[PDB]
RNA sequence: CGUACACGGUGGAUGCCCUGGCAGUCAAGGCGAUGAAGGACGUGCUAAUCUGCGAUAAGCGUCGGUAAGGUGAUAUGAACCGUUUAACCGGCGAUUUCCGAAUGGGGAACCCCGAUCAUUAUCCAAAUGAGGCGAACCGGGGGAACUGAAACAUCUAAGUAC
RNA sequence: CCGUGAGGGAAAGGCGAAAAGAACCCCGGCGAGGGGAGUGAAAAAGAACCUGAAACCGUGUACGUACAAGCAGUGGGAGGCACCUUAUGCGUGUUAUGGCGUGCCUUUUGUAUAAUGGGUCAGCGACUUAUAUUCUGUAGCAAGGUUAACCGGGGAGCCGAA
RNA sequence: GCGGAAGAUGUACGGGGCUAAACCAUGCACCGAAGCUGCGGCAGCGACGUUAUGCGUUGUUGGGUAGGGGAGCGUUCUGUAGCCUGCGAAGGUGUGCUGUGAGGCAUGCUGGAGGUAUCAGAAGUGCGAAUGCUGACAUAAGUAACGAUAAAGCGGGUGAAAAGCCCGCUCGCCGGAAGACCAAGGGUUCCUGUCCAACGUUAAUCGGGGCAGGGUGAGUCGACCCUAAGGCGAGGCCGAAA
RNA sequence: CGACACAGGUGGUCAGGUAGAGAAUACCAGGCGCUUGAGAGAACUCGGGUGAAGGAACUAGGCAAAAUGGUGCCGUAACU
């Protein structure tokens, strides 16, 4: 399944996405349980909901469904007024990223 | 008022395109493209051409590397060539008496004869 | 990690459109002590804005027009109005709080009276005037300097700016 | 929105023929979102929603690549790998190795230059009016020629004619 | 040829190196430029003949900063003649072909509404290059920065989630004070309930955050009243008057 | 108020709450924990303590630091 507007950073995304791009879906669940990176959740509530809807709908066996291709490239950037520095105003060019994951049978 | 049009923004590419043999930048950028190809056009304003009359220092000094193995060389090899027969021009020649252990002698027994 | 491209994104250019501007032309042209212009506060069942009114408050009356639908911009929910012909568009009359030229006096809109000058004068303010506003045009007075003279004291900019 | 105040002062346009604006179901902490599905000619229109580029981001593809020396090419000859929508011993992508190669702009007698300017991008960004005079090229007609205000007429008047 | 000749992080003719690949007197044969010769091709200028910038012949041959002279492609819109398009245009991306070139043209995809050619005009007409203006963006970096009222810790409660929400205990801080009552000033930020997308330089089931309601009931408190320095308006007096 | 939940600035009353000369430290009352975290026993820098013997030899200058420092008795110079 795919995702959209994520408060993620796109950069700190595709960091946790990696390591969980290879084969074995189970190998994608054990890992990602401990990441110490905000970039673990969200990117996990996917590639989990991806393995799901992959079982029912798009018939497939969980025993042989692996992670083939997982990439994260999305936006958009929105004008934000985050108060940095003692006193000043600045617009954040913060971007986002969608966690698209396709876990079919390999 | 007048919309820039198919000029400028139509001038960035139509350049940056032609660079099949580009550089790190000066292919990604236009403020390097132009001043990069400026050397181009010139630099060889009318020189590739340089090749001939350049590496031609050979095909004359190799021709003796062809001879000087079956008699004399250079001096009297291209002087007996314009003696008997239609006299074959020396271009492909002086490059043939190297990549083939034949035909090279097919211009040594021609010379040294009718000498 | 270098470059090109592909898919997606970012970004917003470009192309097209535009209920806006810019410019010219014709017509028409003043408003206020029967207290205006402007502003404030209110007013719609719910309404915060804008608009309209103003406590008979997005309205009331008359005539004519118009027309069967309508209850402003908002196409919500409820409800209601209209053929005892409304909505909507045009003359005349009524009403028209307080301050404001206000003018009794004081005052950052709040509390008590024709204030001030002046004419007539039954000298009683009794009968009247002035005291404000308005895009820039006409008239009557006061009147520079930077600047030009490649310096500057006539002159010049000026009889302009004010 | 800024300044005590006088005053100063932005940016932001477009869903679709119709909204006809995503019913129903799965997922989720969730009217968020995702999947599936529905509408329509098209949503690769789902709401700062037409089209949607460049700088640029991620991924992926082609090809390099941790002994390698630097404008990063030209010509020659060898290596390969990869692709036969332009069949013909004819090309591309990138590239190993080798021979050469000190960005680009002003000032200055001389700048690659330890002379100045620019981080990059897109958009923006600098000889124009009447009149008069003097030449030139082209064109019409020729001691005559042209009118101005105002009337398709005018000749005032101007220049030329010793 | 030698003595005279002493210096600065490792000493040499370009280097290897050489007794001749030294030096001097002669000599022979070669290598070696866009020079000279020669074939083809483009041009320009000038000369001769000419209506000719058409041919024929001839000369130089044809480098250029400042500067002078001359021709041209492309763009916008308004004319005449004349065409293309949803059996799909303009634009955009990639690619093929042509021209010395400016530039023109075709194919595929996308797009999805208009767009041209000729001749004659009209033009706010074609740009890399001002510590230039405005907006956007990359590298720099995921790098520099968080401290006297230096205070939290151990259990427990609630919760999907609790290091900082709440309970208990333990342990501390402040004392003219982080205590109590008020002026000025600010002004609903107060209380309750429901939440959290935004705010709280982490999190939050918490909030002075978001939403909806609720709250500030004096004759003797204060205002209200008065006056001080001083100010204003009216009469009087001065080119004129605010 | 200072553009900020800016260790800055801002008037009055409570100066008898308990131990000292006193409106000086410790502690009731009352208020508060609203001045970012986790793991080895470096160099270097910010504050500070202690340093043998000499002791201003440092320095423009003893700057800095330190010494003396409560109370009672005795006693107290030049100069004015």
Swiss-Prot record, chain A:
Q: Quote the annotated effect of residue 87 to A/D/S.
A: Abolishes translation elongation arrest of SecM
Q: Report quaternary structure and partners.
A: Part of the 50S ribosomal subunit. In TnaC-stalled ribosomes forms part of the binding pocket for L-Trp with the leader peptide and uL4.
This protein's species is Escherichia coli (strain K12)
Concerning Pfam families, the annotation shows:
Ribosomal_L22
Anything else of interest in the record? The wild-type allele (erythromycin sensitive) is dominant over the resistant allele, and is also dominant over the temperature-sensitive allele at both low and high temperatures.
Mutating residue 89 to S/T/V leads to what result?
A: Abolishes translation elongation arrest of SecM
User: What is the stated purpose of this protein?
Assistant: This protein binds specifically to 23S rRNA; its binding is stimulated by other ribosomal proteins, e.g. uL4, bL17, and bL20. It is important during the early stages of 50S assembly. It makes multiple contacts with different domains of the 23S rRNA in the assembled 50S subunit and ribosome.
Which NCBIfam families does the UniProt record give? rplV_bact
Q: Which HAMAP family match?
A: Ribosomal_uL22_B (MF_01331_B)
Q: Which family does it belong to?
A: Belongs to the universal ribosomal protein uL22 family.
Output one GO MF annotation.
large ribosomal subunit rRNA binding
- Does the record's keyword annotation contain RNA-binding? yes
Q: Where does L-tryptophan bind?
A: 86
A single Gene Ontology CC term:
cytosol
One biological-process term from Gene Ontology? cytosolic ribosome assembly
Concerning InterPro entries, the annotation shows:
Ribosomal_uL22, Ribosomal_uL22_bac/chlpt-type, Ribosomal_uL22_bac/org-type, Ribosomal_uL22_CS, Ribosomal_uL22_sf
UniProt keyword list: Antibiotic resistance, Ribonucleoprotein, Ribosomal protein, RNA-binding, rRNA-binding
Protein's name according to its UniProt entry: Large ribosomal subunit protein uL22
PROSITE patterns reported in the protein's UniProt record = RIBOSOMAL_L22 (PS00464)
Q: Does the keyword RNA-binding apply?
A: yes
Signal sequence range:
none
Q: Per the record, what is the consequence of mutating residue 4 to C? A: In strain: SK1048; decreases translational rate, tRNA binding and subunit association at 44 degrees Celsius; does not alter 23S rRNA or uL4 interactions; not erythromycin resistant
Curated annotation (Swiss-Prot), chain B:
SUPFAM superfamilies of this UniProt entry? Ribosomal protein L20 (SSF74731)
Q: Which organism is it from?
A: Escherichia coli (strain K12)
TM helices/strands, residue ranges: none
- Key word Ribonucleoprotein present: yes
Q: Tell me which Gene Ontology terms the entry assigns under biological process.
A: cytoplasmic translation; ribosomal large subunit assembly
Question: What PANTHER family does the record point to?
Answer: 39S RIBOSOMAL PROTEIN L20
Top-level taxon in the UniProt lineage = Bacteria
Give the protein's function: One of the primary rRNA binding proteins, it binds close to the 5'-end of the 23S rRNA. It is important during the early stages of 50S assembly.
The alphabetical list of record keywords is: Ribonucleoprotein, Ribosomal protein, RNA-binding, rRNA-binding
Q: Which GO terms describe its molecular function?
A: large ribosomal subunit rRNA binding; mRNA binding; mRNA regulatory element binding translation repressor activity; structural constituent of ribosome
Matches recorded under InterPro entries: Ribosomal_bL20 (IPR005813), RIBOSOMAL_L20_CS (IPR049946), Ribosomal_protein_bL20_C (IPR035566)
Residues annotated as signal peptide:
none
Stated family? Belongs to the bacterial ribosomal protein bL20 family.
Please report the name of this protein according to its UniProt entry.
Large ribosomal subunit protein bL20
